[PDB]
Design a protein around this ligand. Structure first.
Ligand SMILES: CCc1c(CC(N)=O)c2cc(OCCCP(=O)(O)O)ccc2n1Cc1ccccc1
Ligand SMILES: [Ca+2]
Ligand SMILES: [Cl-]
Ligand SMILES: [Cl-]
Ligand SMILES: [Cl-]
Ligand SMILES: [Cl-]
Ligand SMILES: [Cl-]
Ligand SMILES: [Cl-]
Ligand SMILES: [Cl-]
Length: 123
C-alpha cells in the first residue's frame, strides 16, 4: 500500500518515505491552500491523480500493486487495472520528487498546516 509507495519514494529519492509525509501543504493525507514548492506540487498532483482513480471506481488509498526499478525506470504491474493505475499515479509522484530533489527543503518537512495560506489550486 503505502508500503509500496513508501518503498518507491525511498528507491527514487534516497530519502526515507517519512521525509515526504507532512511535507508542505499537500504531502500527507488531505491538503489545502497554496503549495509551498515544487515537491509540494508533486503531492497536489498525486492527490488529484488519486481523485481521478476514485472517480473510475478504484480505491487507490487501499490498492496493492507490484513494481520494479531498473536503469530503464519504474515498471508497474498488478492483477487489476486499478492496481496498475495506482502504481502509475505513484510512479509519476516519485519521479516528480526525484526531479525536484534540488529544491527539497528540510524546513518544509512536518510543516505546520496553519502556515498554509492562500487559495487552493484546482486539479
Ligand atoms: C509521499 C507523501 C505522501 C503522500 C502523497 C500526497 N500527495 O499526499 C501520501 C498520500 C496518501 O494518501 C492520501 C489519499 C488522498 P487525500 O490526500 O486523502 O485526498 C497517504 C500518505 C501519503 N504520503 C506519506 C507517506 C507515503 C508512503 C509511506 C509513508 C508515508
Ligand atoms: Ca495530500
Ligand atoms: Cl498526476
Ligand atoms: Cl481510496
Ligand atoms: Cl525492484
Ligand atoms: Cl520511469
Ligand atoms: Cl480494476
Ligand atoms: Cl534542506
Ligand atoms: Cl534532506
Amino acid at each position: 500500500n503505502l508500503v509500496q509507495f513508501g518503498v518507491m519514494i525511498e528507491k527514487m529519492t534516497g530519502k526515507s518515505a517519512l521525509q515526504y509525509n507532512d511535507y508542505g501543504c499537500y504531502c500527507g493525507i488531505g491538503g489545502s491552500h497554496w503549495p509551498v514548492d515544487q515537491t509540494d506540487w508533486c503531492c497536489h498532483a498525486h492527490d488529484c491523480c488519486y481523485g481521478r482513480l476514485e472517480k473510475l471506481g478504484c480505491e487507490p488509498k487501499l490498492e496493492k500493486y507490484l513494481f520494479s526499478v531498473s536503469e530503464r525506470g519504474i515498471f508497474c504491474a498488478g492483477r487489476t487495472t486499478c492496481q496498475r493505475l495506482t502504481c502509475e499515479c505513484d510512479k509519476r509522484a516519485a519521479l516528480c520528487f526525484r526531479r525536484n530533489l534540488g529544491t527539497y527543503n528540510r524546513k518544509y518537512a512536518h510543516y505546520p498546516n496553519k502556515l498554509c495560506t492562500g487559495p487552493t489550486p484546482p486539479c
